[PDB]
Chain A
């Protein structure tokens, strides 16, 4: 009744990529299977219909078959236009409704190691007049996109009230993230200093701010 699929797939250029999509005995075989591809930030489009039939305007590098129970396909080669996820679809007699897979985002397999840039900002005076305080730590220009944010109050780390973002791609294929610490204005003055520690690839960059500049 459920149609499993791996979250993502990887493959070097000019090499076949294996995509797995398996279902139940009534989901596959009893009814035909269908495949669709979705552009990023757009609408999905039909790719493969009627089992092994190939439509006009779609090239021949897509070879797909449902086998007996698990539907698997491979792509001859890899290009930059093939960086789209694929959805496998089939009909279920017991559920009486269509089912779809999770999707496999094919990634084309360069950027060297870069130290992250950390900029920590003190809470604004206008925000402090509104009985609020927020520490803004900004992380930019690091590769690969895997960082861990640690907040230190003098010598005691703090865990309550921290909100961090997932790493997102920049314009120059770099990664960036931001961390926010909601703080009591009475607690900001009572501490000597606040530090934002960013751990990236075993290297830590720490910026320290003070209530008295």
Chain B
């Protein structure tokens, strides 16, 4: 079957997040949907399941009052909402589905998840949405690039000459500073003869803050 979920979202500690999973290709009225979370550095952690036709729900001991369950069988969607999320909730959301009906507690030992939804990635860190600052790195075979400084949150896309320059382009992974802002750099290897003739412009785009900066790299005498 098909189990689509909401796209990636960004959030701020202490705020609220809402995701939804849509059920199609099977009868929604008698098939349970389970919620599980997968954080980097550890494995899956169980959260709970929702009754699609009934209203009784069961939650984990760690998430007894933190989670909320909302359903609407008219559009066959399950609404998942979180309130007062902590800073360590940077993870992905899976709308796992199990065959049959398991409204009771005792049926979980014969219960397995067949099809899984797409990963709804959420980024939570103690920082505000701030546009990046782009500065050129003058060459001193030549190496030139642009550093993407003080941006939040992930991700950023960098390109050279609007995608025309693709050979020798390397994008380094981001780093975490002490101020909570991220830094990234991308260098490209170019011949030393084509320095004063060809123009190299880095195209830094930051989709969460809707910031696009085009900076031209020039040699310094």
- Taking the complex as a whole, does A directly touch B, i.e. does some CB pair lie under 8 Å apart? yes
Q: Which residues of A contact B (CB under 8 A)?
A: 5, 31-32, 34, 36, 42-46, 49-50, 87, 89, 91, 95-103, 119, 121-122, 124-127, 130, 132, 134, 136, 138, 140, 163-166, 168, 170, 176-178, 180, 182, 209, 213
Whether the pair A46, B114 counts as a contact (CB closer than 8 A) is yes
When distances are taken between beta carbons in the complex, the residues of chain B under 8 Å from A182 are 177
List residues of chain A with CB within 8 A of the CB of B178.
Answer: 163
Report if A213-B140 is in contact (Cβ < 8 Å); known contacts: A31-B109, A127-B135.
yes
B149 CB-CB contact with A under 8 Å: yes
Judge whether A136 and B185 touch: CB under 8 Å: yes
Chain B positions within 8 Å of A45 at CB level: 116
**Are A140 and B135 neighbours in the complex by a CB distance under 8 Å?**
no
Using known A-B contacts A121-B145, A122-B140, A136-B137, determine if residue A163 contacts B45 with beta carbons closer than 8 Å: no
User: A43-B118, A213-B140 known; A100 and B145 CB under 8 Å?
Assistant: no
Instruction: Scan B174-194; emit 1 where CB is below 8 A from any A CB, else 0.
Output: 111110000101010000000
Give residues of chain B (101-116) contacting chain A, Cβ–Cβ below 8 Å: 105, 108-110, 112-114, 116
A91 and B108 within 8 A (CB)? yes
Which residue from B44, B105, B140, B174 sits with its C-beta under 8 Å from A96? B105
A164 near B175: Cβ-Cβ < 8 Å: yes
In the complex, 7 of the A-B residue pairs with CB atoms within 8 angstroms, ordered by the A residue number, are A98-B46, A124-B137, A124-B138, A163-B176, A165-B172, A178-B185, A182-B177
B188 to chain A, nearest CB (A): 11
Pick the contact of A165 from B42, B46, B108, B173 — CB < 8 Å?
A: B173
A5: chain B residues at CB < 8 Å are: 43
Q: Which residues of B contact A (CB under 8 A)?
A: 36, 42-46, 48, 58, 60-61, 94, 105, 108-110, 112-114, 116-119, 133, 135-138, 140, 143, 145, 147, 149, 170, 172-178, 183, 185, 187, 220
Bound together, the chains give a CA A127 to CA B177 distance in angstroms of: 17
A165–B137 touching, CB < 8 Å: no
Please, which residue of chain A has its CB at the minimum distance from the CB of B95? Answer: A43
Is A130 in contact with B133, judged by CB distance below 8 angstroms? yes
Residues of A within 8 A of B183 (CB): 134, 163, 180
Q: Is the CB of B170 within 8 A of A87?
A: no
Question: A178 with B172: in contact, given A46-B112, A119-B187, A138-B185 (CB under 8 Å)?
Answer: yes
